[PDB]
Amino acid sequence: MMEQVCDVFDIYAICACCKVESKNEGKKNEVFNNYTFRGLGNKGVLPWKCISLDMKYFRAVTTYVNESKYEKLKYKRCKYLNKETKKLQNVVVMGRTNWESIPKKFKPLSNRINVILSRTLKKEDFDEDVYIINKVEDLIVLLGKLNYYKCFILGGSVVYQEFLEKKLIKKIYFTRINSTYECDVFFPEINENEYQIISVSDVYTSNNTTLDFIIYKKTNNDDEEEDDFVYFNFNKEKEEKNKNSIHPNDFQIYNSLKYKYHPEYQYLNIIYDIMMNGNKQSDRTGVGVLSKFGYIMKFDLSQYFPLLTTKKLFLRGIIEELLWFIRGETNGNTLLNKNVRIWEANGTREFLDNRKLFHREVNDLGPIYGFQWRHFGAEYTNMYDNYENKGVDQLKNIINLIKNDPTSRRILLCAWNVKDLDQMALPPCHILCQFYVFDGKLSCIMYQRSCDLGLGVPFNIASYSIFTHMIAQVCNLQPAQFIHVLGNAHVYNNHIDSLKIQLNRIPYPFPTLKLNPDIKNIEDFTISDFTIQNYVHHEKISMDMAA
Amino acid sequence: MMEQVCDVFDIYAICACCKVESNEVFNNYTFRGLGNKGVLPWKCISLDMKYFRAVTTYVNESKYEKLKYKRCKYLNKETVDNKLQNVVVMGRTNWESIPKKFKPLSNRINVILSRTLKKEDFDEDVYIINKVEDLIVLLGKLNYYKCFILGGSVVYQEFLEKKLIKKIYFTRINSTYECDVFFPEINENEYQIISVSDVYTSNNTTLDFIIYKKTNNKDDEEEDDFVYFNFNKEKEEKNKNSIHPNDFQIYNSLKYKYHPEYQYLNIIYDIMMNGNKQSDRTGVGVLSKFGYIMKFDLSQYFPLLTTKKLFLRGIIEELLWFIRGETNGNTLLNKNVRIWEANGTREFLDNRKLFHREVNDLGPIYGFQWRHFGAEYTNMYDNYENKGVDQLKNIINLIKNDPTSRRILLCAWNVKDLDQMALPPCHILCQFYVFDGKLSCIMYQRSCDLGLGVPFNIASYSIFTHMIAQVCNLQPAQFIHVLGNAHVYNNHIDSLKIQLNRIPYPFPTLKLNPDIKNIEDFTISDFTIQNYVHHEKISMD
Ligand SMILES: NC(=O)C1=CN([C@@H]2O[C@H](COP(=O)(O)OP(=O)(O)OC[C@H]3O[C@@H](n4cnc5c(N)ncnc54)[C@H](OP(=O)(O)O)[C@@H]3O)[C@@H](O)[C@H]2O)C=CC1
Ligand SMILES: NC(=O)C1=CN([C@@H]2O[C@H](COP(=O)(O)OP(=O)(O)OC[C@H]3O[C@@H](n4cnc5c(N)ncnc54)[C@H](OP(=O)(O)O)[C@@H]3O)[C@@H](O)[C@H]2O)C=CC1
Ligand SMILES: CC1(C)N=C(N)N=C(N)N1OCCCOc1ccc(F)cc1Cl
Ligand SMILES: CC1(C)N=C(N)N=C(N)N1OCCCOc1ccc(F)cc1Cl
Ligand SMILES: O=c1ccn([C@H]2C[C@H](O)[C@@H](COP(=O)(O)O)O2)c(=O)[nH]1
Ligand SMILES: O=c1ccn([C@H]2C[C@H](O)[C@@H](COP(=O)(O)O)O2)c(=O)[nH]1
Secondary structure (H helix, E strand, O other), X not given: OOOOHHHHOOEEEEEEEEEOOOOOOOOOOOOOOHHHOOEEEEOOEOOOOOOHHHHHHHHHHHHOOOHHHHHHHHHHHHHHOOOOOOOOOEEEEEEHHHHHHOOHHHOOOOOEEEEEEOOOOOHHHOOOOOEEEOOHHHHHHHHHHOOOOOEEEOOOHHHHHHHHHOOOOOEEEEEEEXXXXXXXXXXXXXXXXXXEEEEEOOOEEEOOEEEEEEEEEEOOOOOHHHHHHHHHOOOOOOOOOOOOOOOHHHXXXXXXXXXXXXXXXXXXXXXXXXXXXXXXXXXXXXXXXXEEEEEEEEEEXXXXXXXXXXXXXXXXXXXXXXXXXXXXOOEHHHHHOOOOOOOOHHHOHHHHHHOOOXXXXXXEOOOOHHHHHHHEOOOOOOOOOOOOOOOEOHHHHHHHHHHHOOOOOOOEEXXXXXXHHHHOOOOOOEEEEXXXXXXXXXXXXXXXXXXXXXXXXXXXXXXXXXXXHHHHHHOOOEEEEEEEEEEEEEEEHHHHHHHHHHHOOXXXXXXXXXXXXXXXXXXXXXXXXXXXEOOOOOOOOOOOOOO | OOOOHHHHHOEEEEEEEEEOOOOOOOOHHHOOEEEEOOEOOOOOOHHHHHHHHHHHHOOOHHHHHHHHHHHXXXXXXXXXXOOOEEEEEEEHHHHHHOOHHHOOOOOEEEEEEOOOXXXXXXXXXXXXXXXXXXXXXXXXXXXXXXEEEOOOHHHHHHHHHOOOOOEEEEEEEEEEOOOOEEOOOXXXXXXXXXXXXOOEEEOOEEEEEEEEEEOOOOOOHHHHHHHHHOOOOOOOOOOOOOOOHHHOHHHHHXXXXXXXXXXXXXXXXXXXXXXXXXXXXXXXXXXXXXXXXXXXXXOOOOOOOOOOOOOOHHHHHHHXXXXXXXXXXXXXXXXXXXXXXXXXXXXXXXXXXXXXXXXXXXXXXXXXXXXXXXXXXXXXXXXXXXXXXXHHHHHHHHHHHOOOOOOOEEEOOOHHHHHHOOXXXXXXXXXXXXXXOEEEEEEEEEEEEOOOHXXXXXXXXXXXXXXXXXXXXXXEEEEEEEEEEEEEEHHHHHHHHHHHOOOOOOOOEEEEOOOOOOHHHOOHHHEEEEOOOOOOOOOXX
């Protein structure tokens, strides 16, 4: 290498970008890409009032130093300048407008060497402990004279534009604010060939927005204990086959990422695991799956709504399904009249006949979820019957227990009624929900005996997440964790190519779910009581690719 | 001038010890069998052999310079002497004991402590020595990564006596053999264990690998990226219970905790550090968390906890009682199995509003749901033959006829019958999975008393997996344990703190009488545990 200025001087950019108005931004038919998050500023200030978690991120990154790693950095810089060889601090560079946007109580930025770029102002115009430079070149001369750890370009847009076009940035630390505000300055459109995303953080809520932290990297375009690790892996040739192979190069992006901390990676990593280590099994008439047995996902509903972003999902159907369940309905026609076709195939004359339900009316699904939720143990007759005060009203029971016996270890909703399995159109995939209450917070475990990772699971995650919110609210609690246990976890072979596409997509910050807060009984919700805010997602995928 | 010679020249011992012939008390000295009649005590353990090969062969050429620099400084020298391999040192008996076809040991500087024979009869690359002192001389003049003392007894004895050993790479063979020669008693004060491997089956024995270390008293680009993602972690606020982790010195002093028993101990450590303080229906406190998974590989071991003593006659009798479909508490009481006694008292049933239920009539619990799900429960004496759904019969038929079915569940949580039960089932369901003639089992437990309950529960369902596997001509693969409400009783904490500071032993094995091929034909005599090496019993209360 002919060492580059950005690598010698460790020059990084840090920014936060929200989404922008854009003539309503198309409206619902909207395309999303990394350029969706581009809003920097409005009227010489930030577009948002306070996002404290971003502020705390920005301070920790820009203040953090590692003394032991100075030796190697001084040598490199001294070598580069062909030269021989206080508390160590980072340098932070601000345009004059950026500097003027910062309230006085914050500046100069604590535990940091403050640098301001200006032509109009000179050192005589500042009271503060700051360096003025009038030239990008004077910054590089200055880093050559100073003891510092890393150099952070803090914006604004004009400063971002010139440091990027000069190829002076080695990584961009980029906050995605997943909300829309009025903006009049924007971050430069990043060239996907110059910079690639290498890391994605967990998703958080701060001040009524979700947000995450991504890292772009510029492209090329007691030691003793370490050996004991090698020894303990003398037998790792069984997972070194990765039985199925499916080729490395099909996951360049997935495998390129260094930190994969976005909760959507719980889903994508299970799909990777099944693709590389799954067992080949028969399924039905030849169809074919890769299968594994026993996974757990955990989703923090206090921080986000885990609606998958690596493809497009609609929730109207699965919400109409959940309301249908809560009503205790088994009538397929109710959903079909709402153009929800989830249960259509399971209600046909042929499907019911092949289940031996010869005496069952078309779209009479029998004693499935709804009936077990409101009437477990009652004799199923038909889908029109009035089952009032027949069987156990489980739903009512668990709402009572959450409200009056919250430390109970017996708050389960169970759909797997052994007596009734053969009368069901098909037995339930979603066996039981158990609830947990601590400190005014409701968590839900859902055990799923059979899990179609390609099609079913993304919707099942959404269903039980919404359900946790509904139970949390009618019992006066805040939603905490939704915990999803996978028994038979499988990828249909038909889905494999579609999933390969999806695995190489980078998740977006999750949306948020809003419930009408006036709804105080589980029975009183209707479709318009549910709102998904700030859903940023990749393009729709048909998992079939054929029909 | 404060540097051990052992640290300079990097002298490690590597041994394999089985158990020896004669309630038994176990300790690290339990495992001391080395040899028998100038030969290994056992026919052939291919996994110990494989481990041996790798550890003694392996070098890191990128880490040698730092070694050559501390070494040549020490000898009051500067240069190499006046492809990097390791050094391997054998006693003469140890040297002869090897079948010729292994000698000299591939890719290794073979040495031989022999006061008797000399260079004469042997090539170059095969050094010989008269004293221990003359080994240091030869390492002083050599290019070698690390020096491994390969035994035998006399050699370990005198190398350990002369404080010359930096670490002991110690294989525990968990079977008994006839033996002439033994490893010395390793002083708990001289040495300490810093690492425990996974447990393995090789040649009809379980074994693990542990590391003793001599006691000290007696791209960084993405290294910073890692710290940025921790910007929002709680430091001492998230370690939010003052259980005082410095009471777990042993637990926290181990580097590598790969023994499957750590799946249990780590969950206890987690609920102690991060658990939520709650009341419960007994009124004693708990620390509780929600949602864990443990997986045990039944093909390699029987996961009976070793960090305390467990008894299994009672839990097997419970299981056989379930399989029979019994709900009669008295059957168990008359066999001195008292698991369900408290749940069958007049006072307990009355407080459960079961005023019309006879003592020790537990109602439609496990056994009744497994063999009669949906039948109308009358009393514990009624004949229920061919009433309700025989789930146990059904899961076995599905395993044999439809093994790729995703509907092989055994469910005890009969919502209709809960109020009639002495108490609702803690063990909600079992799901089964068949691949390549191998049976795995998930058991979902809604309520988990770590400490008293869960250790038994692992054993119960591990045994059941073996029984269903046998009668379906399958091999057991994984038992997978999902914990919903996972709690440590505050009255258990002092006892668990003692337990976490104990190092597991290699697991035992379960042998079933192999003639049994119908789930109903098992009897208590059909179950044996082999090679159960355990720490002292603990009263959890
Ligand atoms: N969301 C985020 O992460 C961030 C948002 N912001 C916001 O961005 C906006 C500010 O951005 P913007 O308007 O582009 O202005 P900048 O903050 O980029 O500052 C521009 C000014 O800096 C000086 N300058 C820049 N480059 C040079 C140079 N090479 N040599 C000499 N002087 C130079 C000039 O000062 P002069 O005119 O005095 O010569 C120039 O007018 C505000 O809304 C602020 O709130 C800012 C940083 C980060
Ligand atoms: N379990 C394990 O990991 C291992 C077990 N073994 C087993 O142990 C037995 C071998 O142990 P053991 O019988 O005690 O024999 P050793 O292998 O310890 O060899 C003893 C002989 O080595 C020589 N020797 C010992 N000390 C010195 C010294 N200080 N200076 C010069 N020569 C020395 C002498 O041979 P001479 O009289 O010729 O000078 C001595 O009689 C066998 O049954 C073998 O299979 C062996 C290796 C590993
Ligand atoms: C937006 C922000 C702070 N976050 C990220 N990720 N990257 C940045 N470059 N940022 O801007 C740094 C300069 C602006 O500073 C402030 C503005 C308003 C204040 F009230 C206080 C401050 Cl300190
Ligand atoms: C027991 C053993 C092999 N394993 C461990 N962990 N530590 C040791 N010191 N070992 O002994 C090494 C010398 C013995 O070598 C052989 C004996 C018989 C053979 F047929 C082949 C060989 Cl190589
Ligand atoms: O909500 C649902 C319903 C169904 N399935 C999938 C799992 C299996 O692929 C199939 C059910 O088939 P059985 O396991 O019942 O055979 O449907 C889901 O993933 N989620
Ligand atoms: O095999 C068993 C039976 C019971 N329990 C524990 C869980 C709780 O500590 C208690 C059951 O009481 P409830 O959770 O149902 O209140 O018994 C176990 O851990 N294992």
